[PDB]
């Protein structure tokens, strides 16, 4: 006698899509950023 208990999970509703993986983004930021963070101290 509700007509409503369906409706809470009835409704269905992409710039928030990521492109790369998680740890692949880290091993690019570390393997490129750390040499350029130390060489810029040498300059």
């Amino acid at each position: 006698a509700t007509e409503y208990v369906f409706s809470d999970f009835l409704l269905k509703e992409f710039k928030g899509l990521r492109l790369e993986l998680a740890v692949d983004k880290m091993v690019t930021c570390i393997a490129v950023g750390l040499p350029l963070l130390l060489i810029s101290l040498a300059f």
Partner: peptide, 15 residues
């Protein structure tokens, strides 16, 4: 902060 940081660090190393 990686597409923007690696594109900003690339030009400020050579200067």
């Amino acid at each position: 902060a990686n597409n923007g940081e690696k594109n900003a660090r690339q030009r400020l190393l050579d200067s």
